[PDB]
């Protein structure tokens, strides 16, 4: 059944996970990036140095033109383009085909990535944040409305060691995760906003006001690489991680992800870096579960050469809220249960780990006043 969709995401490692799609009639194949952070469907529609192909509206018989321009700014990069519609399909997804809004990307700055092998972007969020407003049914909202696929998808992003994944449209593939699923309510349907109720580093409470963790918002977002924390929370986590891992001294510039750390191949002392835990507001009143990544999720590997492995620190600061990007997701099977307004995590059956540690989802934990953790205005 969903086996057709298992392994349907590829990625040039550190350049984002993408699912192949076709656009228009006849169907021009394009690799689209999977992004739960954005809510806009958009494909490169005019040449650019970085992308080896693009969308030629001229050659698509099913292509209409909406006669309105669009501007989208990402935390990293931005583009502007022309809004069309056209027939969309997914080879290693459901054998269905919809008319869905498409943004033809005709101008961009620091968006496309060199070597990334993607050429477009699939914003999977909700319409509330679509650009230029909520009258632009996001691709998925249409896919469900126009077909029989149920309102739900799940993502298993698979990291590399010393890249691949699966986006399951409409269902849950039980072969991709181990143990139970645990669900946190989606706080509001715009981003996939969740509420973190406690943070631990190697088990040590960060001991900050619950609000500070969701300061602005905390969202799940496959498009972002790092785990991104609000400043007070970042500076706090860097101290605690520095503390624990202090078995080795470190350039001030490493924690800013400006410098890389290197060891003779394989001799990477994983055991000295702390695990990180996020507790999430659970489905049941006054209850909560935690999720725990390893150094192997927050130390993204980077291909200097030689017989040495090098890693970049993938926890960075953020002015706009927590962002649980690939660093977190690379450790779990994440189920975006749009239907039941909730999100589930389960230990991804393909998360990099070592002999002595592994990523974890675990619960429940008695937590009170969790509703008190969400920020406002």
């Amino acid at each position: 059944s969903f086996v057709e969709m298992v392994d349907n995401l590829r990625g040039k490692s550190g350049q984002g996970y993408y699912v192949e799609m076709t656009v228009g009639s006849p169907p021009q194949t394009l690799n689209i990036l999977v992004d739960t952070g954005s809510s806009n469907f958009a494909v490169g529609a005019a040449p650019h140095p970085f992308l080896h192909r693009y969308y030629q509206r001229q050659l698509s018989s099913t292509y209409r033109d909406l006669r309105k321009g669009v501007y989208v700014p990402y935390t990293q990069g931005k583009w502007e383009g022309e809004l069309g519609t056209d027939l969309v399909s997914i080879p290693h997804g459901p054998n269905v085909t919809v008319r869905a809004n498409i943004a033809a990307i005709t101008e961009s700055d620091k968006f496309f990535i060199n070597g990334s092998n993607w050429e477009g972007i699939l914003g999977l969020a909700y319409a509330e944040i679509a650009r230029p407003d909520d009258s632009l049914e996001p691709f998925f909202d249409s896919l469900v409305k126009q077909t029989h696929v149920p309102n739900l998808f799940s993502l298993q992003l698979c990291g590399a060691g010393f890249v691949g994944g699966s986006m399951i449209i409409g269902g849950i593939d039980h072969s991709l995760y181990t143990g139970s699923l645990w669900y946190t309510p989606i706080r509001r349907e715009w981003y996939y906003e969740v509420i973190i109720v406690r943070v631990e580093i190697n088990g040590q409470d960060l001991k900050m006001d619950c609000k500070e963790y969701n300061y602005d918002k905390s969202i799940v977002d496959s498009g972002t690489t790092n785990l991104r924390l609000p400043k007070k929370v970042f500076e706090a986590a860097v101290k605690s991680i520095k503390a624990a891992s202090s078995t080795e001294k470190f350039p001030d510039g490493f924690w800013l992800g400006e410098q890389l750390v290197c060891w003779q191949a394989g001799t990477t002392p994983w055991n000295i870096f702390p695990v990180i835990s996020l507790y999430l507001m659970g489905e049941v009143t006054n209850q909560s579960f935690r999720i725990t990544i390893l150094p192997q999720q927050y130390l993204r590997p980077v291909e200097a050469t030689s017989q040495d492995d090098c890693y970049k620190f993938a926890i960075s600061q953020s002015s706009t809220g927590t962002v649980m990007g690939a660093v977190i997701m690379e450790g779990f099977y994440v189920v975006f249960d749009r239907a039941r307004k909730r999100i589930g995590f389960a230990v991804s059956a393909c998360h990099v780990h070592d002999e002595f540690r592994t990523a974890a989802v675990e619960g429940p934990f008695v937590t009170l006043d969790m509703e008190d953790c969400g920020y406002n205005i």
Partner: peptide
């Protein structure tokens, strides 16, 4: 990836 809201 969105910035602003």
């Amino acid at each position: 990836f969105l910035a602003x809201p």
